[PDB]
Amino acid sequence: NYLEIEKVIGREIIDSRGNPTVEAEVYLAGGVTGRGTAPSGGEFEALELRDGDKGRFGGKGVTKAVQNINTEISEILSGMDASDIYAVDRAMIDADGTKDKSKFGANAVLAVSIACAKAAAAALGVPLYRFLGGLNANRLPVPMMNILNGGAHAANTVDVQEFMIMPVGAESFREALRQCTEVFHALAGLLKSKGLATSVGDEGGFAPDLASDEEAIEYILEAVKLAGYEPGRDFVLAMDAASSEWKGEKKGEYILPKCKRKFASEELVAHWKSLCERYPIVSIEDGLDEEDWEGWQYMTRELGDKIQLVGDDLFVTNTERLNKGIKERCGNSILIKLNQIGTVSETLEAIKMAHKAGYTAVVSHRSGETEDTTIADLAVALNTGQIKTGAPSRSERVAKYNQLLRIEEELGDSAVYPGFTTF
Amino acid sequence: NYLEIEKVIGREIIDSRGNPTVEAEVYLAGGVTGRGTAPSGGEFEALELRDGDKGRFGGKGVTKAVQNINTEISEILSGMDASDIYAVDRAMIDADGTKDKSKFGANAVLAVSIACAKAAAAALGVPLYRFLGGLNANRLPVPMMNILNGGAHAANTVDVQEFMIMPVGAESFREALRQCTEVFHALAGLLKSKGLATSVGDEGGFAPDLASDEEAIEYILEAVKLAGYEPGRDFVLAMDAASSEWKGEKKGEYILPKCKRKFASEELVAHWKSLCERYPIVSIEDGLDEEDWEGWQYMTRELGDKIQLVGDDLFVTNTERLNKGIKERCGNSILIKLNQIGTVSETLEAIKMAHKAGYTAVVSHRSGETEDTTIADLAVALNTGQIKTGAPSRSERVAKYNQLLRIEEELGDSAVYPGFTTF
Amino acid sequence: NYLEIEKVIGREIIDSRGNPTVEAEVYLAGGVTGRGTAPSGGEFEALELRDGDKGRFGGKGVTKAVQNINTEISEILSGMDASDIYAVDRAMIDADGTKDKSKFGANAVLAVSIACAKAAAAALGVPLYRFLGGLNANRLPVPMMNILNGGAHAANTVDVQEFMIMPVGAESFREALRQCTEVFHALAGLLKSKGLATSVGDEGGFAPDLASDEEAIEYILEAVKLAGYEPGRDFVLAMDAASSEWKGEKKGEYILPKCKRKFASEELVAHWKSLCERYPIVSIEDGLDEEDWEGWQYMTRELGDKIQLVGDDLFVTNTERLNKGIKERCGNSILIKLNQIGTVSETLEAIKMAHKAGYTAVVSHRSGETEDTTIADLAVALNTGQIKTGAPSRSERVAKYNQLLRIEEELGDSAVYPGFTTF
Amino acid sequence: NYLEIEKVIGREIIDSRGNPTVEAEVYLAGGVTGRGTAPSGGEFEALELRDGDKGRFGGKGVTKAVQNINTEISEILSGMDASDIYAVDRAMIDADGTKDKSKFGANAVLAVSIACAKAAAAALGVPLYRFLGGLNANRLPVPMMNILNGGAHAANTVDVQEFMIMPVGAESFREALRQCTEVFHALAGLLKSKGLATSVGDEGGFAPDLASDEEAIEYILEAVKLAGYEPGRDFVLAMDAASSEWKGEKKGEYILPKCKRKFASEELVAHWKSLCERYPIVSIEDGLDEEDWEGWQYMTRELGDKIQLVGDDLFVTNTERLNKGIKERCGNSILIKLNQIGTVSETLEAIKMAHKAGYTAVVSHRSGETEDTTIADLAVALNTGQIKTGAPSRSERVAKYNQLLRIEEELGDSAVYPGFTTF
Numbered sequence A, B, C, D: 001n002y003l004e005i006e007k008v009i010g011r012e013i014i015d016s017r018g019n020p021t022v023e024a025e026v027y028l029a030g031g032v033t034g035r036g037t038a039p040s041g042g043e044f045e046a047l048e049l050r051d052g053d054k055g056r057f058g059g060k061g062v063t064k065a066v067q068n069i070n071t072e073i074s075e076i077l078s079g080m081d082a083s084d085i086y087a088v089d090r091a092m093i094d095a096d097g098t099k100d101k102s103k104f105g106a107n108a109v110l111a112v113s114i115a116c117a118k119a120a121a122a123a124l125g126v127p128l129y130r131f132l133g134g135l136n137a138n139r140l141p142v143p144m145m146n147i148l149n150g151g152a153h154a155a156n157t158v159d160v161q162e163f164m165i166m167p168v169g170a171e172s173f174r175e176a177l178r179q180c181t182e183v184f185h186a187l188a189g190l191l192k193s194k195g196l197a198t199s200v201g202d203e204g205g206f207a208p209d210l211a212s213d214e215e216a217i218e219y220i221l222e223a224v225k226l227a228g229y230e231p232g233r234d235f236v237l238a239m240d241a242a243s244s245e246w247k248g249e250k251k252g253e254y255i256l257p258k259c260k261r262k263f264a265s266e267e268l269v270a271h272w273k274s275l276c277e278r279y280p281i282v283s284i285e286d287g288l289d290e291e292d293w294e295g296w297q298y299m300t301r302e303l304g305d306k307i308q309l310v311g312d313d314l315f316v317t318n319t320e321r322l323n324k325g326i327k328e329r330c331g332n333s334i335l336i337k338l339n340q341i342g343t344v345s346e347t348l349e350a351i352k353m354a355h356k357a358g359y360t361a362v363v364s365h366r367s368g369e370t371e372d373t374t375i376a377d378l379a380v381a382l383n384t385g386q387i388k389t390g391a392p393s394r395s396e397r398v399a400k401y402n403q404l405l406r407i408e409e410e411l412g413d414s415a416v417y418p419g420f421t422t423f
C-alpha cells in the first residue's frame, strides 16, 4: 500500500548531447518517489518515440512519449505494487500492444520501468542494487573505459570505433577508477606533447588524428606506462570494431572505410588474432558483421577460448538473437543496452539468459546519456563483473563511476572486485 | 530533533574532468539525508585542499579533505539544527580558523554546507530553492551558454575565452533551453560544413580552429540564423575576455597572447565598444585586468550604461573586493562561484551585497563540475535572473538545465522568465 | 495531504481605531490553522468591501467581506496546497473577476492570503519570514518611528504629516528599538515641561501644538539630545510631507493648508534641499504631488543622490505606477502597503520590482492596524531594511517591534542590522 | 511525557506605553509552546523586578527578571507537568523565598505562569478558557470601557479618574462591542464639534478639557444618545473615583486636588449617592480611601444594595485584604489584577474567594498592556461576567475584545451574555 503507485509523470529533459529524452517520476501512496530516464543511441530493437516536429529540436522532441506517460501509462499503472516490476513492465508491454514498444515509445516505457524500481527500492529502504539483486549482489564491475576514439565519426584515420582500457589488476573498484583516471590524463599529456587535440567526443574520450588502429593501441599502451602501470598485469585492452560499418561487396567481405584494407571474413579473424598476439587485447566487440553468423561461428572457434567476443550489433539486446548466437556458438559475451529492450525486467531476463549460457554480460551506456546512474546499480545487482560506460570525463559517464564508488563503500567487506578473473 | 544532524561523512568522487573532488553526505536524526559536492576550477579566494601525493591522481587526491569531514567537521556539527545553515557554516568557519578555509579545505566546507541545506530542505519537505529563497523565489535565470571557446587552452587564434549565447527572446526557460540546443546543433553543423572540429572542451562547447574573436562571433551569429532565430530579438551574446591573462609590461597595458595586439586600458575599452556597436554583445566578463581598478572605473563610465560588465577575477566572489568595486564604481555585475567563497550562507551574503548595489549576480559553474545541480536552485532561490553553466552538452552542464526545467514546472503560473529585462 | 486547505472562515474584528476589519482563519487537513487580518486607511488601489449599513458601526461593517470568505472563497480554496500562495492568490483574484478586488473585497482577499501563508508556515514548522524569504532572510529593518505628528488630522500648526526618527547608529534591532523608546520618552518629558499635550494619535505619536515643521524638527532633535544621543551618528529623521494634501490652484503649484505658504514644484524642492542641509533628514515621503510627475522627475535629479524620496501616494503600491516611476526616474523608494495591492504574492512582486530597479521598499502599517504582525516578517523576509510602523507606543504598533525582537533573537548571529547602510 | 516542561525562556519586550516588560515562552516535551507576558501599572502587592540601570530604558529594563526565567525558573520547572499550574506556581513561589515575589520578580513569575497555562492548553488541544474553567466556562463578560479620563495625569478639571460605559442591554458580546465602538465614535464627533481634543490616553480613551465630573458624565450620556442609545436600557456608567489620590488632612477626610472641594468620609458617600440618583451610574471603584475601612463599611451599608462598589486599591488583589473587606462588610466587588498577585493559580483563588462571598470579580488590565489577551480568557474561564480593559481603541485593549469575539463564536449556542443581570 505504501508501495502502491498513485501517479506517473513524464517530462522532456535534455541528454548529454543536447538532444531531448524522456524522464519519468513515479509517485507512491507513501509519498516516496522514483525517477528514471531513457538514454538514446534499428529493426530488432525497441523503438524510442520521437516527435518529428521539424520546428522543435530538429524533430527530436519527445513530447508525445511524455504525453503517453502522463495519460495512458499513469492510468494503467495506478493502483499497482511498484515492487512488482515484472507486473508493471508487463502492463506497459500489453497496453502498448506492439513488439517494439512503438506505441508508447521504448523511451517512455524504460523511463517508467526504472522510475518504478527506484520508487520501490526507496519505499523499501534499500539501495537499488539490493532491490534488483538482493543480498547476492556484491560484485563491482571491471570497467572498460573508451579513452581513444576512431571509426565513423572521428577526425582521424583510425577505423576501429572504441579503444578501451580495463584495470584488471586493481583490488578494489576505487583503485581501478583512480588508475583509469591516471592513464587518462597521461594519454592527454602525451597527445598534447605531440601537438594532437585533447578535446573529447560523446563518451568523454579523445579522437586525435592518429594513423591507424595500431598507432592508437600504442598511444594507449604508452599512456599506461607513463601513468606508472604495466600492460598485461595492470591494464588490458578491449576494442569495439563495430565492423557492421565495414560492409564489403558481399557477405563475408569487409572493407575498412579509412584504411581501405579489404578482408575476407576469415582474414579479418586472422587479423584480430595477430592483433591479440601482438598486444594485450582481451576483448573485441563486433569483430564481424551483425549478420556474418557463419563468420562469428568461425571466429568464436578460432578466438573464443582466449578472447572475449562481445556481440553488440550482433544481438541488440534481443533474446531471440541472443538465443540464436548461443545455439550456433557465436560470441561469448553480450553488450547489454537497457533501452534496446525497453524494460528493467526484460533486461534481467536477457542477462539471465547470457549468464545461463556462460556468456558475460557487459552492461552498457549509450552515446546519449543522462545524470541517471541506473546501469551502475544494475551491473552490481546481477554481478555482471563488467561495465562499459565511457572515459572518466563528462559527468554522464563519471556519474556511473561515482555511483559505483558509493556502492562499493556501502558493501563494506562484502564487496568483490574480480579483476582479471571476471572474463 | 528531526532536523538534528547525527553524522556527516565525505567521499572522494571524480569530477567532470576526471579529477577527484569532495562529496559530503549529511544524516539527520529523522533519517533524512542530504548530499553536496564541491566543484573545482588564486590568493583572495578560499583554498581547496589537495593531497599533493604524486602517487595518487597526480597529486590531486582529496582524501585529506574527506578525513576532515569524517572526523573534525562531523563532530563539530553533530547535534546542530541542519536548517540553521548560517550557524552550521559559522561553526565550520570558526573551527577552521583560517582566512581561506585552508584547515578543512574550502572543498570540504562547501560540500558539507550544501549537503546540510539539501538535508534540511528534504527534512522540511520543500525543494531546495524554496528552502533558500522561500515563497519569494520564482525567477528562472537567462542562461549564458558557452558554445565556442577561445583563449588559454584552445586550439585556435581566438583570444577571448568564452563566447556565449543568451536566449533573451524566449518567454519560458523551457523554450529558451530548446532554442539554445537548436543553435548548438546548427553551429555544430556549420563547423562540420567548414571542415572544423566538433569535439568539445571542458564546458561542452566547440574549440574549432578559428582566426579571430570576430570570426567566432560571426559563426555563432550564423548559427543563430541557421537555427531560425534573429540576433538581437532572440539571441544576444556574452563574452568572457578573461583579460587578466593578457598582462602587459606595465599595469594598464595589455597584450593579447595570440593576436599580439597591444592595448592601453582606455584603448582596450574602446575596442570592446566597437565590438558592441558591431555585434549584439550585451555582457563582457573581465573586460580588464583583475587589478586595473582605474581602467575598470573608466570602462564602467564608458560602457556600464549599455553593456553588462561582469567581474569574475575582479571579485573572486569576495565581498571585500565586491564592496571595493561598488565603492569605486567598478563593474555592474558579479560572477558568483560558490566554491570561491566556500559556504552557502556566505554566497547568499555576496549575492545580497551585489543586489543591494544594483549589480546583477551571475551564478556560475566551474570547469570541473559534477552531477550536482545546486547552482540551478541557487539561481532561482535568489532570483538572480542569470546563470552561467555551460554549453548544452555534457551532463555536468545539462543536469543544471534539467533541474531548472523541473523547477519551472514546479512553480507553475508563478514562474517568471525575465528574458531581455533581466539585465 | 497536510498542506491541503480544508476550510477558510472569516470574522469581523475591531482595529486599533475602533472600526471593523476582516480576520481570516485558514484550516489545513493536518490540523494546523493560520490567522490573518486586513489593516485599513482610492482609485489605483485594491478596494476594501464595507457594508454601508448606517445601523451598524456607522456604515463600516465588514459582514459582506466576511461572508465572501465563508462561502465563495472557502469553496474555491478548499483542496488547494496552502504553500502555493501564488496559486491561492490567483484563484481568489480570478474568481473575484475585478481589477481591484472590489467583488470579494480587498480586505477579504488579503486576510485569507495572509492566513494561508501563516498556515503553510506553521504546517512546515518554520517562521513566517523563513517561509516567505527562506534562508536568505536575515536583515532586520531600520524603523522610522513617527513620534511627532502634523498634517490634516493634527491639531497644531504643523503641515508636514509625519516626523520620524531612524536609529541608524545602533548595532542590533534590539539596541535600535531601545534607543527609540528612550528618545520617545524624552520628547514626552520635553512636551510636558513646555505645557504641551502628550496624549497620542492613531500611530502612537504626539501631536503637540507646535508652530511649524522647523519647530517640530527642533523638538525631536532636542528629544534625541536629551535621551543621550547625537543627531547624525545615532539618529536621523525621515518625514512624510503628504504633499498631495497641499494642492495649489493649478498642477505644479502647492499651498501648505495651515502655513498658507505657496510653492512651485521647483520651489518646494529647494525647500526640502535646505531643510536637508540644515537638519539630518535622510528620507522624505511624498515631497511632491501624487501626479506631479515632472516635478518628481526634477526632484529626484536634484535630491535623489543624497536623499531618499519615498513614493507613497505617488505609487499606491501599484506596479504600473511604480514602473512609470522607474521609467521616468521619479523617486528612489516606495512605501509598501499590503492592503493596497491585496495579496501576499502580489506584494512580493511589487517589492521585487522595486529592488530590481534599485528602489528601496519601506514596508508600512496603516492608520487602522490590528494585533497582526505580518509586516514584521514581510520586512525581514525580503530583506527590505526599512519598516514604517508607528511610534513605540500602542500595541498595534509595538507588537511589530516585539516580533522583530523575537525574529532577531531567532536569527542569532545570522541577524544583520544595516543601520545607516540601509539607504 | 508531552506535558513535561523542557525549557522556559524569557525576553525583554516593549509594552503599550513604550516601556520594557517580561515575556516568557514555555517549551513542552511534545514540541508545543506557550507565551505569556506581564502587564505593568505598592506595599501590599507583588513587586515587579526592574533593573534600575539608568543607562537603559531610563532604569526600567527587565533583563534581571529575564535572567531569572532563563536560568533559575527554567531549571526549577524543567521536567514538571505543565498542566499542573498550581504546582508550577508553587515551585516558583517557594524558590523565590519572598512574600512579594521580589527575588525573581512578580513580572517574571507571572509571565511564566501564564506561558505554562497557555502551553498546557495547547498541548491538550483546548482553548485557554476551557483549560482554566472547563466545560463550565461560558459567560462572556460585560465590558466597562474607559472612554473619558480625568484624575491625576489629565489636561482637564475632572477629579474622577476613569469614566466608563457598560453595554448592559445587548444580547451578545458581539452586539455590546459594536454598540460601544459606536458610542466611542459619537463621543469623538461630539468632542470635535466643541473644539475639544480627540487624541487618546493610555487606555484608548479621551482626555479633553472639561470642567467637572458632571460634564464628563453628560458628554458621555450625550454620546450615548447621538449613537442612538438610551441610558438605563442600553448603557449604564461605571467610574473609577480612585479616591486614594484624594488624601485628606487626616484619615476620613478627602480633598479633591482639582475641585479643591473638601469631604468627610460620610459626606463623600452622600455625594456618590446623589450622583447615582442624578445619573445611571451602577458601579463605583474606590469611592473611598484604600484604608478608610470604617468609611467603606459605612458606604457599603449606604449604597451596597443599589450600587456596585469595587475595591481596586482597597484590595490590591490581595486575599488577606479581600478577606478583611469581606469580614468587615466593605465593598461588594473586587478589581482583579493578575500581576498584583503574580500567578495564575493565586489569581483563581482570589476570584473564588470573591465569588464565595458574593462579591463580583472585575478582571482588569493595567495601564501598561501588551498584545497578550490572557485576561479575556480568564474572565470567561471563571464566568466573572465583567471585564475592565479599556476604550475600544489601541490594540493592547482591542485585542482583548477581539479574543472575546472569538470565544463567543467558539461557544456557539452555549454562550451566555448576562448584560444587566451581571451585577
Ligand SMILES: [Mg+2]
Residues within 6 Å of the ligand: A240, A242, A285, A286, A312, A313
Ligand atoms: Mg558497439
Ligand SMILES: [Mg+2]
Residues within 6 Å of the ligand: B240, B242, B285, B286, B312, B313
Ligand atoms: Mg571567467
Ligand SMILES: [Mg+2]
Residues within 6 Å of the ligand: C240, C242, C285, C286, C312, C313
Ligand atoms: Mg503617507
Ligand SMILES: [Mg+2]
Residues within 6 Å of the ligand: D240, D242, D285, D286, D312, D313
Ligand atoms: Mg483604579
